[PDB]
Design a protein around this ligand. Structure first.
Ligand SMILES: [Mg+2]
Ligand SMILES: [Mg+2]
Ligand SMILES: [Mg+2]
Ligand SMILES: [Mg+2]
Ligand SMILES: [Mg+2]
Ligand SMILES: [Mg+2]
Ligand SMILES: [Mg+2]
Ligand SMILES: [Mg+2]
Ligand SMILES: [Zn+2]
Lengths: 82, 73, 21, 97, 592, 42, 70, 40, 87, 58, 145, 50
RNA sequence: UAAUUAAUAUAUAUCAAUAAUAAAUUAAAUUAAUCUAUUAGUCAGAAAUGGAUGCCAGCCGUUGCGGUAAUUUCUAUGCUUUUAAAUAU
C-alpha cells in the first residue's frame, strides 16, 4: 500500500540513548554547585482524570514505540527458544 | 513477583510523585569532564557529579525499570 | 524538512551560508 | 578536603605528608566516610577510600528520615538529626544525607 | 573597606563593545541550499534524530508513523502509489520467509531417529538425551534466525530490501493499526523490547547496530573499545539474547496461568465464586494471589471475546481501596499510599483478641452471607468511599451530594419616604450598593454555615441596592464573598488541580525571565503543541474537584532564606536561579 | 576554659523545649493575662 | 543495648511546673503529617491520674508534664 | 486535619537522584528460605 | 564583633570630621612601612573630640572635612577609624 | 506555634472584648469613655482574661 | 483552521482579530494556522465523545436517556471527520443500546445513507473502496495502466 | 455492628495496593540539559534543564 | 441645606511613608500624564594576562600579601558573577 521505491541514504544512528558525548576541557560556568542548587516548579502528573483532546500519553507513547520497534527490527531475531 | 522482580524506582525532583524517573543523560554540562576522566583512567575511582548521570562505568546503566532483584542471567 | 535524510553528518557544505559571488 | 601535615621521621629527616577526608556514597541507601594521612596525594586518596569502605553504614529507608530526634555528639561536635518536611541542612551535610 | 577611595565606580569597557558586533553579519546572498527555503534560519547539518516531531508544532507529522515520512514533501508523497501489500518487496520477503509455512522443508528423520524420538516422547527414563527437541522449537528457531539473516541494502546486489523499503512497509502498517492491533503491538513491545531497554549498555552499541547493518560514526574506536571491554568477561556473559534467562519463583509460570483455572465454573455463576475458593489454589501470599486472580479474570474475558469487569480489582482489593481513599483524604495527595506514610502506633501483643473472638464465634445463615464482597462496609461513610468513582452508583445512591436547592433571591420592601419626589432620585444611582452586616454575633468563620442558614433568625443580613433603586437579598456568591476565602479541594477520587505547576505558574515566578507564552512548542515546558479548549467544558463535572494552594512553592519563595555556600561569593539562596545577564544589550530589528 | 561559658554535652530535645514553653509570655498574651491599661495599637 | 534511648524529666525543679495544653500534646503526636506514637510523654491530670499523652489527647484533657521516654 | 500534605514534601536537589520504596525494603522482598525450607 | 572600637561613632554608621594633622606611624611586625594617620576633630553636644584615624583616601586639591567610616582591623595597632571620601 | 500567633492585631489571637462586659456589667465602658483625662496615656483598665482563668471565681 | 476556526485565505495566525482568543496572550508570540488531517480530525472526534458522555452525566443540563437528536448529531460528526472505524462501531453499539430496544432512538434514512456514503468514500483496510482514485503512473510497479 | 460483635475490617488489615496493569514505558522527555552540543547549554542561554 | 460633580494638595516640612513597581525582544481592551536610570570583584573562594613597583608605595572581612618573576599593591585590557550595590553601623 502506498509504495514508491525510495532511496534513503542517511539514517541517523541508533536511538540507544547512550553515545559517548562530546568532550571539552574547560567549561563555561566553573560552578558545580548550581547542579545541586537548581530547583524547578512541581510536575503534577495528573489533574482530574487527566483528559485531553489531543491524546498525549497514548499518541506519544505509540510514536516512540514505532521508531524503537523499527530500529530493533521488531526484536525478532534476538530471542531464541529457551 | 513471579518474574524478574520489582523495579528500581528512583526520582529526580521533589518527591516520588513530583519528579521524573529519569536521571539526566551524559550530554549535561557538569557530567562531561567527569565522564571524560572515567573513560580515560577507567580503573581508578573518580570524583564528580558524573555519578548522578544515567550513564556509568558499570555494564548496568541507570535507566528506569531496572529489575535489580532479578537472578539474572 | 526532508533534506536531513540525505546529508553527510560531518560535512556542512557551506558553514558561512554566504554564496558571495 | 586535602591538607598538608609535616611528618618528622628523625631530627634531620622531615617528610611532607598529606591528609585526605572524603565520603563515599550511593543514593540507594549506603554511604561511608574515611580519612587518611599518607605520603602522596594519590596515596591519601586511595587510603581514605578503602578506609571509607571499611566504615560503611546503611539506613533503613522504609521510613525516609528519622522518626524521632537523634541528639549525639562526635568529638566536640554536637549534632541534631530531626524529622522535617523536606531536607534542610548545610549544603554538604545536605547531600551527605 | 570602601571601594571608592582613590577612584569612583569604574566605567571601563561598560559597553564591552568587543561583544557588540562580530564584524560579519548577513546579506541578500544567503545560500538557498544551507538556509531555510525562506532564508529565515540556518539548517542544522548533524545526523537526523528520529523523534523530532515531539519538539515542534507541525501537524503533518502526526499523519505518519515514522519520522522520515513526516518530513517528506507532498510532491514526493504523491508519487507513492497504492499497490498490494506484498508487492512491496519487504512485504514480499515477509510473505516468503515468515508467513509461508508450506514452503519450509525440514530435515527428514531416519527411521532409527523416528523410533528413538517416539519412545523418548511417550515414556521418559532419566539420564537420556535431554535435547529430543520438538520440531516446533526447531521451526521457531529457523524463523527467528531468518530474522537474524535478513539484511538490508540495494537489491540488485545480494540483499532483499532497501532500508527505505522496509520502513516504508512498516510505516504504511503502523497507520493501518486498529485498537487491539496496536494493543497486541504494545504488548509484544513490553514483553520483548522493554526489558532489553533496561539491560542495555555501551558495550552492545555495535551489536545493536548490527540489527539494521547501519554504520556508526566512531566505528573504528568502538571496535577497539568494545573489544578491550568484552575481553574482560565470558562471551556468554556479554551477549544480550541470554541476559533475561532466569526468573524468581519457578513454581508458577506465567505461561501456565494463561489457561485460567476453573474457568468453566466461575464463568457461569461468578457470585458463588468469591476469591477464597480460588485462592486455595496458590501457595503464594495474599497480595500476590489476589493479583493473579485479577489477571485470570481479565485473560478469561478477553478469551471469550466479552469485556471484563473493571471493578474487580476494586472488589478484591477493597480493603486496600479504602485504606487508600482515606489516606489520600488524610495526607493530601493523589496516588497510592506507600509505606513511609503509615502510622507509627505500636499495638500490644494481644491487641487482636476482641476481633479474634468475634470472628471465631461468628455464624452465617448461608455461605454467600459468609463471604460476600461488601461485608467490608457498615456506615454510610464506607459506602461513600467504596463508590465514589462510579458517578453512576454514587449519583444514584447519594442524590443530595449535588446541591439542587438554594436560598431564592428575593426583593425587600422599601421604607416609605415622606419627603416624596423631592428625594425620590436619591437612592437611585450609578452603581450597585452591597451592605453586609457585622457585629458581635456575626462574621465569624467558625459559625459560618449557621450564619448563612435560612432557618436561623439571628442570621447575618445582607442587602443590595440596584442602580434603579430597588433592594434585593444577596445572591449566595455575594453572601460568601464576605468571609475569608475558603479552599475546597478533596483528594479521594480524582486529582484536584494543583498550584505552582509547570503549566500553572506564569513566567516570572517559574523562571526569573519573561518567557513567551505561545500556544505552540514550549521547549521549557516539554510540551509539543497545545489546543486550548475552555477548561471545564469537555470534561465531566464530577472530575472537577478543587484547587490546593496550601504549600510553599519552593522554586519561587521559601522560609529561612539563606546562602547555600558563603564562598565563593557567587551562590545565593536556592530560590535565585537565573541565567547570566550579558554585557550591554544588543537589539536586533524583528519583523524579519 | 575555666573562665568561659558552660556548654551542653549534647543538644536539647527540641520537642521538650517546646513543651516547657506552655506558660510563656506569648501564650499569656493570648490568654489575656495582662491588663490593658493604655491605648495600645491604633 | 537498652530499650530506653533517652529518658528525661520535664522539670529540673519543683519550683517550676510545666503545663501541657491539649494542642501541644497533640503536636508531639504528629511528625509532618504522619501519626507518630514512638516517644512517650507522661502527665498528671486535674484528676490525679498518671497518663501518657496519647490518652490525654484522646479525651482532650490538659495535664502537668512529668517526663519523656523512648 | 493535617495540612502538611504528603504530596508536596521533599526538596529538589537538582540533578541528584534518590531511591524510594513502593512498599517494603527490597531485602525483605524475597522470603524463599522460609518458603522452600532452607533454614537450620 | 568588637563593639568598643566604635566608641566615637556614637551609634552612627558614618561621621564628619575636620582635618588637623597628618603624621606617620610604623605598623606591627612583620609588616613594615609608613602608614598615614590623620588626626581629626568633631563636636558633639558642644564637646570637641579629637578622633584619630587611618588615612586610606585620595587627596585632591586642598580640602578640610572627611567622612569617617568604621571597622575591620589594620596593621597599625590602635587605629580603629577609617576614611571614606574627602570634602 | 509561630510568629503569626504573636500578632494580637488579628481578632483571632486576642481575647474578645465582651468579656469585660461579663465582668463589669453590660455597656459599662460608655461611661468610662467620656472621662476627663483619658487616653493620655491611660484609659480605665480593660479586663479581658479568658473566663476560665478568672482568679476571683475559679 | 481546525484549532481557532479562522478562515484560511484572509488570516495568517490563530486567533487574529478575535477578542476572546486563548491562543494569543499578552507578551506571547503569534502562532501560525494548523492544518486539517488525522490529528485534528480525531481531536474533533474526541471532543464530540466527551460531550456525548456529559449529555447523560450532567445533573442540571442532562437528559435521562439519549435523545435521537444527540445520536444523529454524533453520527454526523463522525461522518464529517471522515472517521470510519468509529462510525461503524458507534452504529452497532447504538442498535445494541437500551434506547434502541425501547424504540426511543431509531436509525432514520438520513443517518443510514450518510453512514453508507462515508463507508464508501474512505479507505477500507483490506479492500479497495468506492472513491479510490486510480493512479495512471502506478504502472511503474503494478505493470498495468 | 451495633452491638459490637461484628468482625472488624479496618484500614489496619489492608496491605500494599498493588500495581496490576503496568502503565506504559515512560520515554525520556528531552530537556534543555540534554543537547549534543555543549553550546545551547551555555551560561548566556540556559539557566537550567527547565 | 455655605458646599458635597467631592477625594487635587504647591512646593513645604517633620521625624516618617518599606518605589531599581514586567532593570530588558513582540506593545500597552487608557485617560498617554512622571521618568531617560549606574556601580561590584578579579589569592584563598566564579574569574587573568601585560606593564610598572621592589618590605617601598599600597592592599587588610580574615589567615595574611609586598625580598626584581606579586594569580593578594598600582595601571591598562580582558574576564567573572544566582541580575533592587558595594560599603560602614
Ligand atoms: Mg470489640
Ligand atoms: Mg556601641
Ligand atoms: Mg590585619
Ligand atoms: Mg517572640
Ligand atoms: Mg578559582
Ligand atoms: Mg584591593
Ligand atoms: Mg622592575
Ligand atoms: Mg599581576
Ligand atoms: Zn488557526
Amino acid at each position: 500500500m502506498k509504495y514508491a521505491d525510495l532511496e534513503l541514504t542517511t539514517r541517523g544512528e541508533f536511538p540507544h540513548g547512550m553515545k559517548e558525548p562530546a568532550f571539552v576541557k574547560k567549561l563555561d560556568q566553573n560552578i558545580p554547585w548550581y547542579f545541586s542548587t537548581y530547583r524547578s516548579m512541581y510536575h503534577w502528573p495528573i489533574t482530574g482524570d487527566n483528559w485531553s483532546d489531543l491524546n498525549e500519553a497514548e499518541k506519544h507513547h505509540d510514536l516512540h514505540m514505532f521508531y524503537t520497534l523499527a530500529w530493533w527490527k521488531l526484536g525478532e531475531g534476538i530471542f531464541g527458544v529457551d | 513477583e513471579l518474574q524478574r522482580g520489582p523495579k528500581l524506582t528512583e526520582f529526580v525532583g521533589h518527591n516520588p510523585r513530583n519528579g521524573t524517573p529519569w536521571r539526566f543523560s551524559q550530554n549535561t554540562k557538569y557530567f562531561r569532564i567527569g565522564i571524560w576522566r572515567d573513560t580515560i583512567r577507567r580503573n581508578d575511582m573518580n570524583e564528580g557529579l558524573h555519578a548522578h548521570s544515567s550513564w556509568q562505568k558499570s555494564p548496568q546503566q541507570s535507566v528506569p525499570e531496572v529489575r535489580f532483584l532479578a537472578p539474572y542471567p | 524538512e526532508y533534506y536531513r535524510w540525505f546529508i553527510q553528518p560531518g560535512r556542512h557544505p557551506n558553514p558561512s551560508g554566504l554564496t558571495l559571488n | 578536603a586535602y591538607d598538608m601535615r609535616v611528618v618528622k621521621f628523625s631530627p634531620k629527616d622531615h617528610r611532607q605528608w598529606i591528609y585526605c577526608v572524603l565520603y563515599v556514597g550511593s543514593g540507594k541507601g549506603i554511604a561511608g566516610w574515611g580519612r587518611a594521612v599518607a605520603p602522596s596525594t594519590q596515596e591519601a586518596k586511595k587510603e581514605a577510600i578503602r578506609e571509607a569502605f571499611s566504615n560503611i553504614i546503611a539506613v533503613d529507608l522504609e521510613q525516609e528520615g528519622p522518626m524521632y530526634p537523634v541528639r549525639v555528639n562526635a568529638d566536640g561536635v554536637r549534632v541534631l538529626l530531626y524529622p522535617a518536611r523536606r531536607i534542610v541542612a548545610n549544603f554538604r551535610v545536605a547531600d551527605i544525607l | 573597606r570602601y571601594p571608592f577611595n582613590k577612584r569612583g565606580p569604574r566605567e571601563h569597557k561598560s559597553w564591552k563593545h568587543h561583544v557588540l558586533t562580530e564584524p560579519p553579519k548577513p546579506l541578500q546572498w544567503r545560500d538557498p541550499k544551507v538556509w531555510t527555503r525562506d532564508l529565515s534560519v540556518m539548517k542544522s547539518f548533524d545526523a537526523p534524530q528520529w523523534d523530532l516531531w515531539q519538539s515542534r508544532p507541525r501537524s503533518e507529522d502526526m499523519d505518519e508513523a515514522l519520522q522520515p515520512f513526516m518530513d517528506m514533501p507532498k510532491s514526493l508523497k504523491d508519487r507513492r502509489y497504492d499497490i498490494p501489500w506484498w508487492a512491496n518487496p519487504f512485504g514480499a520477503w515477509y510473505l516468503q520467509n515468515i508467513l509461508s509455512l508450506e514452503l519450509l522443508k525440514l530435515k527428514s528423520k531416519t527411521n532409527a531417529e523416528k523410533i528413538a524420538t517416539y519412545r523418548s516422547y511417550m515414556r521418559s527414563l532419566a539420564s537420556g538425551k535431554d535435547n529430543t527437541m520438538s520440531d516446533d522449537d526447531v521451526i521457531r528457531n529457523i524463523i527467528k534466525e531468518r530474522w537474524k539473516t535478513l539484511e538490508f541494502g540495494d537489491r540488485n546486489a545480494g540483499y532483499p530490501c532497501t532500508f527505505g523499503d522496509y520502513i516504508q512497509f512498516l510505516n504504511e502498517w503502523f497507520k493501518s493499526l486498529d485498537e487491539e492491533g496496536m494493543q497486541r503491538l504494545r504488548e509484544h513491545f513490553d514483553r520483548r523490547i522493554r526489558p532489553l531497554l533496561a539491560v542495555m549498555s555501551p558495550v552492545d552499541i555495535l551489536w545493536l547496530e548490527a540489527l539494521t547493518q547501519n554504520s556508526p560514526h566512531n566505528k573504528e574506536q568502538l571496535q577497539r573499545k568494545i573489544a578491550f571491554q568484552t575481553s574482560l568477561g565470558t562471551p556468554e556473559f556479554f551477549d544480550m539474547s541470554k541476559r533475561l534467562r532466569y526468573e524468581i519463583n519457578e513454581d508458577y509460570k506465567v505461561r501456565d496461568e494463561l489457561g485460567p483455572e476453573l474457568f468453566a465454573l466461575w464463568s457461569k455463576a461468578p457470585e458463588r465464586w468469591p476469591p477464597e475458593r480460588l485462592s486455595k489454589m496458590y501457595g503464594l501470599d495474599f497480595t500476590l494471589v489476589r493479583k493473579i486472580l485479577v489477571w485470570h479474570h481479565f485473560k478469561a474475558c478477553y478469551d471469550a471475546c466479552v469485556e471484563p469487569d473493571w471493578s474487580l480489582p476494586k472488589r478484591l482489593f477493597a480493603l486496600e481501596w479504602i485504606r487508600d481513599v482515606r489516606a489520600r483524604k488524610h495526607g493530601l495527595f493523589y496516588g497510592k499510599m506507600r509505606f513511609a506514610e503509615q502510622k507509627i502506633t505500636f499495638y500490644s501483643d494481644r491487641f487482636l483478641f476482641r476481633d479474634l473472638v468475634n470472628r471465631r464465634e461468628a455464624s452465617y445463615a448461608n455461605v454467600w452471607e459468609m463471604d460476600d464482597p461488601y461485608r467490608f462496609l457498615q456506615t454510610e461513610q464506607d459506602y461513600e468511599d467504596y463508590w465514589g468513582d462510579n458517578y453512576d452508583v454514587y449519583r444514584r445512591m447519594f442524590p443530595e451530594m449535588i446541591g439542587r436547592t438554594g436560598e431564592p433571591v428575593q426583593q425587600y420592601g422599601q421604607m416609605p419616604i415622606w419627603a416624596g419626589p423631592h428625594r425620590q432620585h436619591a437612592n437611585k444611582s450609578e452603581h450597585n450598593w452591597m451592605f453586609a452586616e457585622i457585629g458581635v454575633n456575626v462574621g465569624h468563620e467558625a459559625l459560618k454555615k449557621l450564619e448563612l442558614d435560612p432557618t436561623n433568625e439571628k442570621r447575618r443580613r445582607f442587602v443590595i441596592r440596584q442602580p434603579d433603586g430597588t433592594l434585593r437579598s444577596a445572591k449566595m456568591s455575594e453572601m460568601r464573598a464576605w468571609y475569608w476565602k475558603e479552599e475546597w479541594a478533596d483528594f479521594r477520587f480524582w486529582a484536584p488541580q494543583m498550584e505552582w505547576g509547570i503549566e500553572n505558574t506564569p513566567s516570572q515566578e517559574q523562571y526569573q525571565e519573561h518567557v513567551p507564552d505561545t500556544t505552540d512548542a514550549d521547549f521549557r515546558k516539554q510540551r509539543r503543541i497545545q489546543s486550548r479548549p475552555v477548561k471545564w467544558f469537555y470534561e465531566s463535572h464530577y472530575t472537577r474537584t478543587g484547587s490546593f494552594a496550601g504549600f510553599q512553592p519552593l522554586r519561587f519563595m521559601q522560609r529561612r532564606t539563606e546562602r547555600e555556600v558563603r564562598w565563593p561569593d557567587v551562590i545565593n539562596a536556592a530560590v535565585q536561579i537565573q541565567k547570566r545577564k550579558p554585557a550591554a544589550y544588543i537589539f536586533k530589528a524583528i519583523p524579519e | 576554659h575555666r573562665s568561659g561559658k558552660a556548654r551542653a554535652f549534647v543538644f536539647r530535645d527540641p520537642s521538650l523545649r517546646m513543651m516547657r514553653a506552655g506558660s510563656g509570655y506569648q501564650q499569656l498574651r493570648r490568654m489575656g493575662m495582662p491588663m490593658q491599661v493604655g491605648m495600645g495599637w491604633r | 543495648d537498652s530499650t530506653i534511648n533517652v529518658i528525661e524529666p520535664c522539670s529540673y525543679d519543683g519550683r517550676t511546673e510545666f503545663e501541657w495544653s491539649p494542642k501541644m500534646m497533640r503536636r508531639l503526636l504528629n511528625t509532618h503529617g504522619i501519626h507518630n506514637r514512638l516517644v512517650v510523654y507522661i502527665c498528671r491530670t486535674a484528676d490525679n491520674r498518671i497518663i501518657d499523652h496519647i490518652h490525654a489527647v484522646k479525651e482532650n484533657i490538659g495535664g502537668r508534664g512529668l517526663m519523656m521516654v523512648h | 486535619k493535617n495540612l502538611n500534605s504528603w504530596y508536596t514534601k521533599g526538596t529538589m536537589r537538582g540533578g541528584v537522584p534518590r531511591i524510594y520504596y513502593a512498599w517494603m525494603r527490597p531485602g525483605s522482598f524475597t522470603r524463599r528460605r522460609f518458603e522452600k525450607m532452607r533454614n537450620p | 564583633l568588637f563593639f568598643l572600637r566604635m566608641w566615637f561613632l556614637y551609634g552612627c554608621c558614618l561621621r564628619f570630621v575636620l582635618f588637623v594633622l597628618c603624621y606617620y606611624m610604623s605598623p606591627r611586625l612583620p609588616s613594615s612601612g609608613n602608614r598615614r594617620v590623620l588626626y581629626a576633630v568633631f563636636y558633639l553636644y558642644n564637646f570637641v573630640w579629637m578622633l584619630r584615624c587611618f588615612f586610606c583616601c585620595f587627596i585632591g586639591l586642598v580640602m578640610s572635612l572627611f567622612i569617617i567610616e568604621g571597622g575591620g582591623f589594620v596593621d597599625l595597632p590602635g587605629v580603629k577609624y577609617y576614611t571614606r571620601i574627602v570634602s | 506555634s509561630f510568629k503569626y500567633a504573636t500578632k494580637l492585631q488579628h481578632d483571632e489571637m486576642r481575647q474578645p472584648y465582651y468579656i469585660h462586659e461579663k465582668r463589669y456589667g453590660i455597656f459599662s465602658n460608655e461611661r468610662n469613655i467620656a472621662k476627663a483625662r483619658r487616653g493620655l496615656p491611660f484609659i480605665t483598665p480593660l479586663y479581658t482574661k479568658h473566663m476560665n482563668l478568672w482568679d476571683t471565681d475559679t | 483552521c481546525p484549532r481557532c476556526s479562522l478562515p484560511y485565505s484572509t488570516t495568517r495566525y490563530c486567533g487574529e482579530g478575535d477578542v476572546d482568543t486563548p491562543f494569543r496572550k499578552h507578551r506571547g508570540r503569534w502562532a501560525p494556522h494548523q492544518k486539517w488531517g488525522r490529528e485534528w480530525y480525531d481531536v474533533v472526534a474526541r471532543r464530540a465523545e466527551a460531550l456525548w458522555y456529559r449529555a447523560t452525566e450532567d445533573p442540571y443540563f442532562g437528559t435521562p436517556q439519549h435523545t435521537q437528536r444527540q445520536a444523529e448529531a454524533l453520527l454526523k460528526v463522525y461522518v464529517q471527520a471522515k472517521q470510519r472505524g468509529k462510525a461503524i462501531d458507534f452504529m452497532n453499539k447504538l442498535r445494541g443500546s437500551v434506547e434502541y430496544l425501547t424504540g426511543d432512538i431509531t436509525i432514520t434514512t438520513v443517518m443510514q445513507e450518510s453512514y453508507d456514503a462515508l463507508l464508501d468514500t474512505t479507505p477500507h483496510p483490506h479492500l479497495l473502496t468506492n472513491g479510490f482514485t486510480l493512479e495512471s503512473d502506478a504502472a511503474k510497479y503494478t505493470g498495468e495502466v | 455492628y451495633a452491638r459490637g460483635q461484628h468482625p472488624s475490617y479496618d484500614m489496619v488489615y489492608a496491605g500494599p495496593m498493588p500495581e496490576i496493569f503496568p502503565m506504559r514505558r515512560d520515554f525520556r522527555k528531552p530537556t534543555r540539559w540534554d543537547f549534543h552540543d555543549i553550546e545551547k547549554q551555555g551560561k548566556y542561554r540556559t539557566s537550567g534543564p527547565y
